[PDB]
Design a binder for these strands. Structure first.
Lengths: 167, 100, 233, 22, 199, 191, 138
RNA sequence: AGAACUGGCGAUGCGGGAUGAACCGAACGUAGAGUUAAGGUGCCGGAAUACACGCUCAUCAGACACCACAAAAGGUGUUAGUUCAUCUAGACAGCCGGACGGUGGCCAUGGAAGUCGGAAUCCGCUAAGGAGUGUGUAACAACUCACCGGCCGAAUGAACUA
RNA sequence: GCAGUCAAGCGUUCAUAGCGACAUUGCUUUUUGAUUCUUCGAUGUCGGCUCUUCCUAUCAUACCGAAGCAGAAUUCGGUAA
């Protein structure tokens, strides 16, 4: 797409470390990011969150990025999310209608921001999980979109400029 | 859609002539670098040319006096234009960059 | 309350602010009664001069007092009120910005009266020989009338140019005090007409006011000169 | 419920009276 | 109007604050601007909150003690005039002259038959429309303040009445004068038009 | 996060004709005629043939849906109002003092006058808005019937009578004196 | 019962297919495009027949639909999109004239720095002058 | 008030912040041209009435720090989000509607017997009909509800959080 | 000084007609303290008089709510300078 929204960067690496029969074992976090600036950062924050490491103990092997595999079209992304507001972070599973992973980020940001309290310092999320169109449960925007694929309903929905013409 | 609107935009002052007998008033000659399209000049004329009066540098009189021209008529017709100034410009500022 | 315990109304009103000299010798009424009743035979106002005071005895009425019934004394101011010349119909129109006069319709005869219109009203008392009133411009009532036709197409509440003929008795002075008096009454077209009939001739107090009727008096107070807080406030 | 509105109406704000009862 | 000497502007259903931004800037440009149809401008938001703001300003205009200003302006032309003074730098001589260059008249002032014009998306319709906490015309604000207003709408009603007559006969005569193209025409020439611009 | 919206249609009865130009609708029937102006954001409540009156909307939000419900209610009231009428039956109650009620319809500005309400020397009167008609079928002096086509106006006039007689200063329980809505309002008629 | 009602009206709706759309502000430019696939109310996929009309997904509402519609049905892909413009036609023709459109009409005007072309311009009024005269009759 | 560790003011201009010793940018010979910081782009007022979206309608609100206030309590059916349950096998608002039999159940006490206190809790038949939900009398003494059915049709309510 | 929340409790019975502790959050700047910023080449003291303008936390009047308002004196409270 044009001027990102957060392509997920599949960052991989190691650790890589010391003269001991240990070594840390092989990891992944695929993190949504804008390129390498973000790439680094997330990895250190993941390494803080779950793992423990260090900066130095986490070694990055490689990077491979993100465009559109499947259709622009029409997941309605199930997102596992955390929002920081008037104390620390509270858990969320938000399943919202989207075009795509580029979009998902913006639509969630706008939702943390507006609705939930969000401001600067945050981060992000935990996972995004695709779903089948009929399955989608919570609920307002999407319920209409699910119905549209159905169709008929696309003949519905067809509404927005509608009051304007004359014909 | 539009018309003009847009900022691009450089120009030159060719020279500002503060001239009477006591009869005549004041003229300013402007030559914008390539700009206005022949068309963009002609359907229009009255495009207001605003140069900021800033510090360049060392101490120029850095004032909250933003200057606005207008194109009176072309003289040059594809290029050069006549302008007049009305206000007060900063000090012998012919030369200076034209601009929005 | 920081002070006074023990706090009293403030002596002397702010509405009768400024306590200053009147613009004019003669009072000027800012608004008038509404057009409820008969046509401009009904002039909204009349003028006079204060003669003094007298007292009268009358048959009262207020049944609630025991003191009610028989004759009882009541105070009177006498004002000498001569027949007044309605000279002309001035037409003021309502618009936005304010009224501006279209016309004044003149009678044939104001003659000494226009000399009095010249007195302070122009200025200089027989000073150097004239002052002038321009004569009825070789029968150009048509000018005045076409201008009358203009007033009927809208609406001041139709108004009249008046003077008091002072020469009558008490005043050593001869000079007339010119006045703007509003005309009120019925429908507008008949209103212009009645006003028109009236200018042709003088008008008495008998035409304007009935006896006993409720009249608002406007006049200008006695003048002290320059005074301190104690008498003033 | 009934008692809440009685107290509120008597001395509270109108907006303050409604919602909890609901 | 968008030139150097016109300058006549249509107040109908325009936004008060928006009209005043461009008006100030053009007076700073050095034009003499006549703002027309003053009662018909609208400033968005519910009337009650709008009147509460003005009411305090009236309450302010109750004092100082002294006489000689401050002021609260009753009427739609006057409200708009106040709006310019705030919009323009009131401190300076330049600013002051720009203020002298405004005239605001209610209804229409003495005939400007030449059309009053809408400004680039200044109008409240689109500029409400999600929407409309209410929207308040200047004529609606000022009936509550007092009357230079009462005479101005009275004239508006008479002006609109007189002009509305004119416009019907004007338009009739224009389509009539006009049916030029109800096509004639073709005459090789139309091909020339299609080309002529075309190339 | 919603909405977007769609059309709802109600058939217009044969006893009713409606005619619509702009945002203002005339609803007409045998009891008489009713005019109101429905204007609202991005709403139409349109007639698809003299057959159905339909309501449709480009747009929806919480606010819109609440409005559409009011619009749908109002219209149903107008339609029923022209054929059926609306009527309020009201009863005078007076514990001490005779209440003298008449309507000065024919000779004057349309109003209901109540005299000697609570011994009041001063007559209390309020107008009638719209073509609604009041008949007071005295008996002893209990029963008031107020009938009209326009539901709004009928409700207001009946309500006006109730508010005039109200005495806020004394206890209501103690002073029963007034006129109260005895009904709401109403059925149709063979007549 | 001749004629019916009236109902204050009418009908523009088509966020789906068939509905021609007019550009907002963006690319290094501006073009024409139609809605192939509907995601949701906000996001729609918009494409056009040939050249560089590349298909974009955007949140639409800043992007306005134009008065024109063409005849097809919902669910589209590249092969279907090509067939539709070809079948429909007259849509480009409407696109030239005037309905938020005016694009060709403006194109004709835009190209006009010459010697010869200006003369032509004068000629069109010289022709107007004689039709005005022709209206006058004498 | 009185220490520590450090920068500034004092002795440091200029640009930003309405003004304003120590806040931000910035350390300044002169002069010019260019381009930037901080911070800003409806008007005053450079410079956008910018672009994608979402909430808000109180004039909240145009605010880093600041004589910038606003709390406990926070309602809350405002909006949103979450967690647990109920729904096309038909929830839900309202309106409508039904109840035989083992059998008025042991303890204790003046006295509990559906319903003062204190047990187990099976079953008939079976749309369905609990050893019972509240309203009772000294105690007994009805009537409703449970549980069950219909008219309507699509979501639903409770807890926390911002 | 005044207010808000909570409501133990009392009011025959009844939290809330009224009264209302413990606790607890506020607000004001008009008592008192605290300070040492300002003035020691000088700010006239308390109090009172009189003249003005104001404030709202309203004692009365207006309009209203509740009552343990039968009337009726009343009590509490809202709006309101």
């Amino acid at each position: 797409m044009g001027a990102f929204r957060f392509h997920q960067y599949q960052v991989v690496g190691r650790g890589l470390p010391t003269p001991t029969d240990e070594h840390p074992k092989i990891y992944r976090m695929k993190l949504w990011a804008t390129n390498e600036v973000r790439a680094k950062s997330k990895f250190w924050y993941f390494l803080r969150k779950l793992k423990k490491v260090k900066k130095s103990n986490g070694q990055i092997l490689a990077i491979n990025e993100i465009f559109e595999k499947n259709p622009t079209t029409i997941k309605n992304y199930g997102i596992w999310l955390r929002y920081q507001s008037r104390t620390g972070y509270h858990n969320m599973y938000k399943e919202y209608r989207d075009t795509t992973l580029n979009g998902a980020v913006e639509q969630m940001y706008t939702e943390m921001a507006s609705r939930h309290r969000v401001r600067f310092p945050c981060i992000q999320i935990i996972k995004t999980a695709t779903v089948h169109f009929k399955l989608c449960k919570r609920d307002n925007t999407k319920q209409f979109h699910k119905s549209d694929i159905k169709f008929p309903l696309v003949y519905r929905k067809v509404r927005p400029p509608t009051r304007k013409l004359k014909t | 859609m539009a018309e003009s609107h847009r900022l691009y935009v450089k120009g030159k002052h060719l020279s500002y002539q503060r001239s009477k007998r006591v009869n005549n008033p004041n003229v300013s000659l402007i030559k914008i670098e390539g700009v206005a399209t022949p068309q963009d000049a002609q359907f229009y004329l009255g495009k207001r040319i605003a140069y900021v009066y800033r510090a360049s540098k060392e101490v120029r009189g850095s004032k909250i006096r933003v200057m606005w021209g207008k194109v009176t008529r072309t003289h040059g017709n594809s290029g050069v234009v006549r302008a007049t100034f009305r206000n007060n410009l900063p000090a012998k500022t012919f030369g200076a960059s034209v601009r929005i | 309350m920081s002070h006074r315990k023990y706090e009293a109304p403030r002596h002397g009103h702010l509405g009768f602010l400024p306590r200053k000299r009147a613009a004019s010798i003669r009072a000027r009424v800012k608004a008038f009664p509404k057009d409820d009743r008969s046509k401009p035979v009904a002039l909204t106002s009349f003028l006079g001069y204060k003669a003094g005071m007298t007292t009268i005895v009358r048959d009262l009425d207020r049944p609630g007092s025991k003191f009610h019934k028989r004759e009882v004394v009541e105070a009177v101011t006498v004002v000498d009120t001569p027949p007044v010349v309605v000279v002309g119909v001035v037409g003021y129109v309502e618009t936005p910005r304010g009224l501006r006069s279209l016309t004044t319709v003149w009678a044939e005869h104001l003659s000494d009266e226009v000399k009095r219109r010249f007195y302070k009203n122009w200025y200089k008392s027989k000073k150097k020989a004239f002052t002038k009133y321009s004569a009825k411009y070789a029968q150009d009532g048509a000018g005045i009338e076409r201008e009358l036709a203009r007033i009927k197409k809208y609406a001041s509440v139709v108004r009249v140019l008046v003077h008091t003929q002072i020469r009558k008795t008490p005043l050593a002075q001869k000079k007339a005090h010119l006045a703007e008096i509003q005309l009120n009454g019925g429908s507008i077209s008949e209103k212009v007409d009645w006003a028109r009939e009236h200018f042709e001739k003088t008008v008495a107090v008998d035409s304007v006011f009935e006896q006993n009727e409720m009249i608002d008096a406007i006049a200008v107070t006695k003048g002290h000169g320059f005074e301190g807080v104690t008498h003033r406030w | 419920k009934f008692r809440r509105n009685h107290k509120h109406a008597l001395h509270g704000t109108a907006k303050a009276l409604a919602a909890a009862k609901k | 109007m968008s030139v150097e000497p016109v300058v006549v502007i249509d107040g109908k259903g325009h936004l008060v604050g928006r009209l005043a931004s461009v008006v100030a800037k053009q007076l700073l440009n050095g034009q003499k601007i006549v703002v027309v149809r003053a009662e018909e401008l609208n400033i968005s938001g519910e009337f009650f909150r709008n009147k509460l703001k003005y009411h305090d300003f009236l309450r302010k205009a109750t004092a100082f003690n002294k006489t000689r200003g401050p002021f609260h302006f009753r009427a739609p032309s006057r409200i708009f005039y106040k709006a310019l003074r705030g919009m323009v730098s009131h401190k300076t001589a330049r600013g002051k002259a720009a203020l002298e260059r405004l005239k605001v008249f209610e209804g229409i002032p003495p005939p400007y038959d030449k059309k009053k014009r809408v400004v680039v998306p200044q109008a409240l319709r689109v500029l409400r429309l999600k929407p409309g906490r209410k929207y308040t015309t200047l004529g609606k604000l000022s009936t509550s303040v007092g009357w230079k207003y009462e005479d101005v709408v009275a004239k508006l009603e008479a002006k609109r009445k007189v002009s509305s007559a004119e416009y019907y006969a004007k338009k009739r005569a224009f389509t009539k004068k006009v049916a030029s193209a109800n096509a004639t025409a073709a005459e090789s020439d139309v091909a020339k038009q299609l080309a002529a611009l075309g190339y | 996060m919603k909405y977007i919206q769609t059309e709802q249609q109600i058939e217009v009865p044969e006893g009713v004709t409606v005619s619509i130009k702009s945002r203002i609708v005339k609803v007409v029937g045998p009891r008489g005629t009713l005019t109101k102006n429905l204007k609202h954001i991005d709403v139409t409540f349109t007639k698809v043939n003299n057959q159905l009156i339909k309501v449709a909307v480009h747009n929806g939000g919480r606010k819109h849906v609440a409005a559409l419900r009011t619009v749908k209610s109002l219209v149903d009231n107008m339609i029923t109002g022209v054929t059926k009428g609306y009527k309020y039956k009201m009863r005078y109650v007076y514990a001490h003092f005779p209440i003298n009620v008449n309507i000065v319809e024919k000779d004057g500005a349309k109003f209901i006058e109540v005299r000697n309400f609570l011994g009041d020397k001063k007559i209390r009167n309020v107008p009638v808005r719209d073509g609604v008609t009041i008949e007071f079928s005295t008996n002893v002096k209990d029963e008031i019937v107020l009938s009209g086509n326009s539901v709004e106006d009928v409700s207001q006039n009946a309500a006006d009578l109730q508010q005039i007689c109200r005495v806020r200063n004394k206890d209501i329980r103690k002073f029963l004196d007034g006129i109260y809505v005895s009904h709401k309002g109403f059925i149709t008629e063979d007549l | 019962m001749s004629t019916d009602s009236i109902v204050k009206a009418s009908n523009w709706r088509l966020v789906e297919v068939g509905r021609v759309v007019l550009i907002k502000k963006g690319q290094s430019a501006g073009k024409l495009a139609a809605i192939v696939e509907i995601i949701d109310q906000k996001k729609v996929l918009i494409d056009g027949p040939k050249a560089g009309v590349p298909r974009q997904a955007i949140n639409l509402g800043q992007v306005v639909l134009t008065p024109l519609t063409f005849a097809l049905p919902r669910g589209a892909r590249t092969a279907t999109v090509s067939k539709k413009w070809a079948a429909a036609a007259v849509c480009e023709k409407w696109a030239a004239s005037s309905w938020a459109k005016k694009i060709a009409q403006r194109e004709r005007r835009a190209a006009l720095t010459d010697f010869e072309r200006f003369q032509v311009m004068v000629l069109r009024k010289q022709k107007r002058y004689t039709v005005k005269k022709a209206l006058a009759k004498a």
